[PDB]
Design an enzyme around this catalytic site. Structure first.
Site, short mmCIF file in Angstrom:
data_model
loop_
_atom_site.label_atom_id
_atom_site.label_comp_id
_atom_site.label_asym_id
_atom_site.label_seq_id
_atom_site.Cartn_x
_atom_site.Cartn_y
_atom_site.Cartn_z
N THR A 1 -36.12 3.05 33.18
CA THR A 1 -35.80 1.70 33.63
C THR A 1 -36.73 1.13 34.71
OG1 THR A 1 -34.22 0.59 35.09
CG2 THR A 1 -33.91 2.96 34.67
N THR B 1 -40.16 9.66 35.49
CA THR B 1 -41.10 10.32 36.41
C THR B 1 -41.37 11.78 36.12
OG1 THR B 1 -40.22 8.90 38.16
CG2 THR B 1 -41.70 10.66 38.79
N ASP B 2 -40.31 12.56 36.00
CA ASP B 2 -40.41 13.99 35.76
C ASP B 2 -41.45 14.46 34.74
OD1 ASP B 2 -37.90 14.86 37.47
OD2 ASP B 2 -37.23 13.20 36.21
N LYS C 1 -47.65 15.84 38.60
CA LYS C 1 -46.69 15.31 39.56
C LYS C 1 -46.64 16.34 40.68
CE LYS C 1 -42.21 13.54 40.34
NZ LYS C 1 -40.84 13.28 39.90
#
Ligand SMILES: N[C@@H](CC(=O)O)C(=O)O
Ligand SMILES: N[C@@H](CC(=O)O)C(=O)O
Lengths: 508, 437, 437, 508
Positions: B101, B177-178, B255
């Protein structure tokens, strides 16, 4: 002996108090140490959020359009990712919490079985995450008083915003150290019906917080606000009330100001004036002042400035009427006007300030004034004077109707001064990162018993138990020595006079 | 226990109520709207929203009276226009929704937060992008990157090519994100012969909080969609501040942090360029694929029976053995230093290889370049047929292997494949300004 | 194929020989000393060192005549003084040799390189230390950081505790580089109530190369063993050039690079200080354990039936079923982002807790802190009873769980312990200057 | 007609040639580009290594003592970890390897079956790892010549060192861009017995190199070093032989130098003077020069300098004897002395430079010289003067023995000049990071058959096949325009004359 029959008038006084707790930051194991050492700085912008049905909050959209950027100062050792909005919060801090639970009982308030945190949105930028984390901790508490009991509906444990440092245009600087320091908010009920009754409730709470001996005793650390109203008056928010002893008077200088403002509205209604009967038309009386011994205006003109006037039907002898010792309805005009101009001039204050009587009558003409018609002059840059006078208009009309529901700040005199309009209702939504905290009856009991000793109570025990001077007993606590003394006597030593006399007297 | 107890007494979530409960003998009374139970915390407590808007907890046990004053006002229900009329001259850009989102509405009087993805909603939230290009949001699937799988990196690659070949100027993929750096590397190999910009983008801070990084990232993302850069990139904040975003080549992106916007870094190579919402761009390199007319060709081939294994002091070769017995076609080992494994394990690896398993060596230290020729242990692993994956990211090697195996089983071929640079994955040589940067 | 052949014709490695061979029809004549075979390859080739020093390769089939001129001039086997005469007024620092070589002699004529840990050698090789403290080399065991097990850490703690409590001013452990960070974390928890400096040190470049970082690392390390810092630390270069070393707290160090000297970094926390071979120091922190007289107490207890599992898109629950199944008492899952796992796997974890297994959560993003309340997946992992390990290094958490499971098997207790801060392992809060540094 | 009967004088000459390959760096996929952009820098110190029996190389140890640090310059795009010594090397680079192989065959060399890399130790700091990776690739090649075939014992592919930017005291600055560029070294055998033969080998090899068409072309990209000798003289390393066409005269001038020195040594031996007869005692003569008309000495004195002498028994008329056109034995003295002093004065060259016979006789006296004995002055600070006179004594001593072994540099004269002492044997040891490289028999053949055609072989063909005029043929080749020329014709186009003429002549 009172100034007014507060029982006749609709005296309704409410009270709200904020105080920093001396624990770690509310949502991160951080030392509530302020610091003037800035080791690094970072940039940030905040954006309004859509509503249930895609609508942008106006007040926020406004701040947004301004295009301001938020700069935050922090130091490597005291600034952490949590108050950088770079790591989820962790809390509420147990000490800060308990302390809260403790202050709640001291106020006969009932704690909640489970605490849910909220997010109050903040436009300022004073909150890096864009919001302040708050939470109700206890409800319906009370403070017994001579005039009766005053109730405490809410007691909240929230986050304090960060320190403003500079308000450059399109860029506001804030210091993080302050952000996250726990805050205790206690709110009374507008049921308070007496100026001294307020000081009582105000004082008591004050003592209850001191009793925890785990509260911050700082300069700008104690926030106390008042909201006053009268029957046929209006709810006025008086922000930033200095000392506890000022409460009584400030609440009266208000009842007074509001009582006079109305005695003026009744006068206007009689003269038969109306909101629409005040056309917003500007006269360019400038010329009539081309030659005036009033440095003030004269300076304006010489710098390419114009003098404008306004026609206020049946407002003669009232604009200059005093509502508070030293302040008159005109002063109220100047305040609203100050928003665009340093000041104003009205028919009832002059001739004066180097303005020849000639000039006065000469103005009464161009705008054709009656034996009761008045005016207002504002020397400024074209538009400035327009907006300024317009703001004067707004108030003038409101005066015909009654008491403007606004937010005023207290003065040293005890009178108030205009600040801004009554704040809008806040928009909050669940603080989803912090799990709901439950308060075991187990813990509720432990804390409800071992409640601390209210200051006065101690004073009254020293006298009754250790038999010492009331003067010494008070000065012993009133001067924070309340601890040292207990610690001394604890040695079974200095009976009370040895210690009391030593500390309170010898030392000084 | 609160759920049923509630319904019994006929109490609907959203109903304005007046409850009274005995706290320590005392009597207390609240008045608010009934709320949903915290994600996961069963029974014993009822949540109420006072007219203060504040949320409270009531121990059911202690409840003595529950009266409904007003009912659940619940009504309206409004919808927004999915797509909207583009502006003259602007490029076409499709935002494929993968579940990350990038905007949300929030019912303040309810406390709910709804994800938004409509063009209307995106415009009402991010005017900025509708000024850079014509944004066409296309919802592929709402999924958390946490639990994202290969079958998806295929559905994405196709959806991308479609839009890309339909004639969009560039594509933007709203990912989580992950996993993002995994997906990034998938779309890098699958999107063969690319000619336009493909951009992964997500928000480290949820997109409903006034401080979110969704907006600026989106904005920088759409701008990159319009670049002269023909490759899959990740475009995220370059620092803590709302300064500029970094455009990382999708196979050297990792990340590195758990929650900062600063989180995505280019490991072992430089980012492609710095971009400001402003619109300015500063390329950090010259060697990136230029835009062309070339039509994109997907390449689904992938054997997903591949495992990623991180070595640590004292690992029973049994874990490698389990993988072999279970019939895995490839194993990427997150080795040690220049790419080592306890000698205590070499044997199990040696077997998996003889069992026709593809064994590749990466390295626990994210940065740097594996090389099994310097030390004895390395030379051992080489002799055992372990494919040394130069300076490739462990997570990138995992993904590159599923793809390479889906193309062949011949280990001699698997090398070439693996050791062949299809996107940014292997580097000719390691630059000095590539570490911790 | 050559080892035997050589012996067949009766030859010894080292014999000075004269080979004649054919190349494209014609004779080529060499003269050198037969050298040993490449450290890892069957040979159809013979290695010969010429009177140039240059090593050359010859294919067996092409050898037509291989006469022997001189024979293996095998000689001496020199020895050195283990310990050396100390100096008046200098601290006693014992260097526990764990296998990581800090010096070496190289026989140019032979081409062989032998490690060196003898005081008489560390003296001529690295004088610097002996003008700082009386160095006592203590051979504990020769092992590669690659294949080192927990049991070894134990044998280390004792030997450190011993020597330390046996009057030594400070101790310096010469460990290999690959696993150093694991070892560091180990001793950290093992050396309970420490009042003196413990220093792990090793070389990224082998001791023999003129450019080795071995020397400077040693000097800096000894100067620290001599410091007022009472805790386990790792001392390695801080930058790439010969400048200063950094002393990291042994529970927040990770190897972040495959081959650089910058390789070791402090994570989520700041290093303790900067040291220069020169002597100057510069603490970067004030909160470090200080010198004391307390006696160090070794704490052995460690359940080594614990595995470290790094999650990734596409893992099957089978990897976790397998572990529970083979009787593992602890699993440190180094998951995704704030500490997530694919939901398709939360059940195998849910089951591992039911079987009283200790499941700890850390993140693949080396930097940052794990927080499982934010997102749903996290709350789900919480319900399954997973133990969040704050900002603890995944490797550190591994070591720790073993130790902690070596004390309890009760989960409620494992929770408290894991989450208890015995060393820098965890942090109260995250500093802004604690990432990518 | 030669100058000397180079057969009588046992003339032995050797050739050593270094050349850079226009490929990527030998042990890392890096462009062999040079750059004057230095974007970052790092500092480093190297340290000696023990021998099998704890010994430290005097030289490397000596350098350790100087306590110098090595600063390295590099840019973010052309500097990789491998040449920073922060990552293991990968190699050799296949292109460079093959070009090596090609050059080998092209020189009748027999490539090795399997290649092993060595680490030659290097003190300078010019090699960040402490050593230079080298390897033998081919052996026993040979270049045919009018005087007989000359051999090529070894062909090696090694790394070139970093560029030196500055050698401050206690800090040498090096640039990394050049570090790693592939180097092919070709070495002759000490048998070339004629100056011309030398030029021939030198030229053939140079041409084999041009052939490969992937050998760097430019200023500092070619190393041609010679090593001359004579029966009863000494092996003298001559560095910096600029252009191929000087090789014959340099060798000739050297034979002359050595031939003369021997003649002198013989005169000395005849007079009977042993090195011990040259006592290292320095006579202070600053007096005899208190009022001299030599501007040189006069300044030295006024600044507080001295004029020390040296007594050289039976060296009269021998210091001034010419050994090479324009160079005398004293030029050698001065040369060595230059290590501490700008110049020197000696009895054979004066009266002169302002030194009167008076000054000369006054010195001949205070030193008590015979008619065979001579002296040598030096005017400088007392110590410097001594060190110089020491350096001169060492040489006058060496002079009675014969030809001192040394490494001299080439002059535009064709003469040599002392430069430094012969370098010591290098220490080498296995570069275990790079696996042995097996050279397949199929690769050797697939390469050995497609050897490029030498430049001259081309010029000759152009003259036969294409008939074009020689001047045209050569000029096309001698001015590297031979590549383009071949291009034109490939089009079955401009026969030869048109092409040839237009180029070599028209565009000139
Ligand atoms: N759990 C989140 C993580 C994030 O996007 O920050 C996701 O949906 O991937
Ligand atoms: N394999 C080596 C690597 C090193 O230490 O540099 C070790 O023992 O760890």
């Amino acid at each position: 002996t009172d100034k007014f029959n507060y029982e006749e008038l609709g005296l309704k006084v409410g009270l709200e108090i904020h105080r920093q707790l001396d624990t770690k930051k509310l949502f991160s194991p951080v030392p509530s140490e302020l610091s003037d050492k800035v080791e690094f700085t970072f940039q940030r912008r905040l954006r309004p959020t859509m509503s249930e049905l895609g609508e942008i909050d106006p007040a926020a959209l406004e701040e947004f359009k301004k295009g301001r950027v938020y700069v935050y100062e922090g130091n490597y050792e005291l600034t952490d990712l949590v108050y950088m909005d770079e790591e989820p919060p962790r809390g509420p801090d147990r000490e800060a919490l308990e302390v809260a639970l403790q202050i709640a009982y001291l106020l006969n308030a009932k704690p909640v079985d489970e605490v849910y945190y909220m997010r109050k949105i903040v436009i300022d930028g004073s909150n890096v995450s864009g919001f302040q984390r708050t939470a109700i901790i206890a409800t319906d508490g009370k403070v017994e008083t001579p005039w009766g009991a005053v109730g405490i509906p809410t007691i909240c444990l929230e986050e304090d915003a960060a320190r403003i440092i500079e308000r450059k245009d399109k860029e506001v600087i804030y210091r993080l150290d302050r952000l996250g320091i726990p805050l205790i908010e206690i709110s009374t009920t507008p049921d308070i019906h007496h100026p001294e009754q307020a000081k009582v409730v105000a004082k008591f709470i004050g003592d209850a917080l001191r009793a925890t001996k785990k509260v911050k005793r700082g300069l700008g650390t104690i926030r106390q606000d008042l909201n006053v109203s009268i029957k046929g008056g209006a709810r006025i928010e008086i922000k930033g009330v200095q000392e506890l002893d000022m409460i009584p008077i400030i609440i009266e200088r208000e009842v007074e100001r509001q009582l006079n403002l109305l005695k003026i509205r009744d006068e206007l209604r009689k003269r038969g004036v109306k909101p629409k009967d005040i056309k917003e038309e500007f006269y360019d009386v400038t010329d009539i002042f081309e030659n005036t011994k009033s440095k003030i205006i004269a300076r304006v003109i010489k710098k390419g400035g114009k003098v404008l006037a306004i026609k206020l039907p049946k407002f003669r002898g009232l604009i200059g009427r005093e509502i508070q010792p030293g302040r008159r309805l005109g002063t109220e005009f100047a305040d609203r006007a100050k928003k665009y101009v340093p000041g104003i001039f009205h028919i009832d204050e002059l001739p004066n300030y180097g303005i020849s009587q000639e000039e006065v009558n000469k103005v009464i003409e161009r705008l054709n004034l009656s034996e009761e018609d008045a005016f207002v002059l504002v020397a400024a840059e074209e538009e400035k004077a327009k907006n300024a006078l317009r703001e004067v208009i707004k108030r003038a009309r409101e005066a015909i109707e009654g008491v403007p529901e606004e937010t005023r700040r207290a003065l040293p005199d005890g009178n108030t001064e205009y600040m801004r309009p009554l704040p809008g209702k806040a928009r909050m939504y669940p603080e989803t990162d912090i799990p709901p905290l439950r308060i075991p009856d187990d813990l509720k009991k432990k804390i409800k018993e071992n409640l601390p000793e209210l200051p006065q109570a101690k004073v009254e025990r020293y006298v009754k138990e250790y038999k010492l001077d009331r003067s010494l007993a008070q000065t012993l606590v009133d001067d924070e020595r309340d601890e040292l003394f207990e610690e001394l006597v604890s040695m079974g030593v200095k009976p009370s006079l040895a210690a009391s006399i030593l500390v309170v007297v010898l030392k000084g | 226990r609160v759920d049923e107890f509630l319904k019994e007494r006929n109490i609907n979530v959203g109903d304005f109520v007046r409850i009274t409960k005995e706290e320590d003998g005392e009597e207390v009374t609240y008045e608010g709207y009934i709320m949903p139970p915290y994600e996961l915390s069963a029974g014993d407590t009822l949540v109420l929203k006072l007219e203060n808007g504040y949320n409270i907890g009531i121990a059911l046990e202690k409840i003595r009276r529950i009266e409904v004053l007003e009912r659940a006002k619940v009504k309206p229900e409004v919808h927004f226009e999915a797509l909207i009329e583009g502006k003259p001259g602007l490029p076409e850009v499709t935002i494929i929704g993968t579940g990350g989102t990038i905007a949300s509405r929030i019912d303040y009087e309810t406390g709910a937060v709804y994800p938004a993805f409509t063009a209307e909603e995106l415009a009402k939230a991010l005017p900025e992008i509708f000024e850079v290009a014509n944004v066409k949001p296309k919802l592929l699937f709402n999924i958390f990157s946490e639990d994202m799988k290969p079958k998806h990196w295929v559905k994405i690659a196709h959806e991308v090519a479609k839009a890309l070949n339909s004639g969009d100027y560039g594509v933007v993929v709203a990912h989580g994100t992950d996993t993002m750096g995994y997906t990034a590397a998938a779309l890098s190999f699958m999107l063969r012969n690319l000619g336009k910009p493909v951009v992964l983008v997500g928000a480290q801070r949820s997109s409903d909080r006034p401080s979110s990084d969704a907006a600026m990232n989106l904005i920088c993302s759409v701008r990159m969609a319009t670049s002269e850069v023909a490759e899959v990139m990740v475009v995220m904040h370059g620092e803590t501040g709302d300064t500029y975003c970094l455009a990382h080549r999708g196979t050297k992106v990792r990340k590195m942090h758990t929650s900062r916007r600063d989180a995505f870094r280019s490991i072992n190579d430089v980012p492609i360029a710095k971009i400001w919402p402003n619109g300015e761009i500063e390329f950090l390199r010259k060697d990136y694929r230029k835009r062309s007319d070339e039509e994109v060709e997907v390449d689904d081939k992938i054997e997903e029976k591949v495992a990623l294994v991180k070595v640590y002091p004292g690992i029973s070769s049994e874990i490698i053995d389990f993988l072999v017995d279970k019939g895995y076609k490839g194993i990427v080992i997150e080795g040690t230093g220049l790419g080592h494994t306890p000698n205590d394990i070499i044997p199990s690896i040696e077997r998996a290889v003889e069992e026709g398993v593809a064994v590749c060596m990466t390295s626990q230290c994210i940065y740097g370049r594996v090389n099994l020729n310097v030390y004895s242990t390395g030379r051992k692993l080489l002799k055992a047929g372990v494919i040394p994956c130069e300076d490739m990211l462990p997570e990138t090697a995992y993904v590159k292997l599923m793809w390479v195996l889906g193309h062949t089983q011949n280990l001699e071929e698997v090398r070439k494949m693996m050791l062949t640079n299809y996107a940014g994955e292997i580097t000719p040589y390691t630059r000095f300004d590539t570490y911790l940067r």
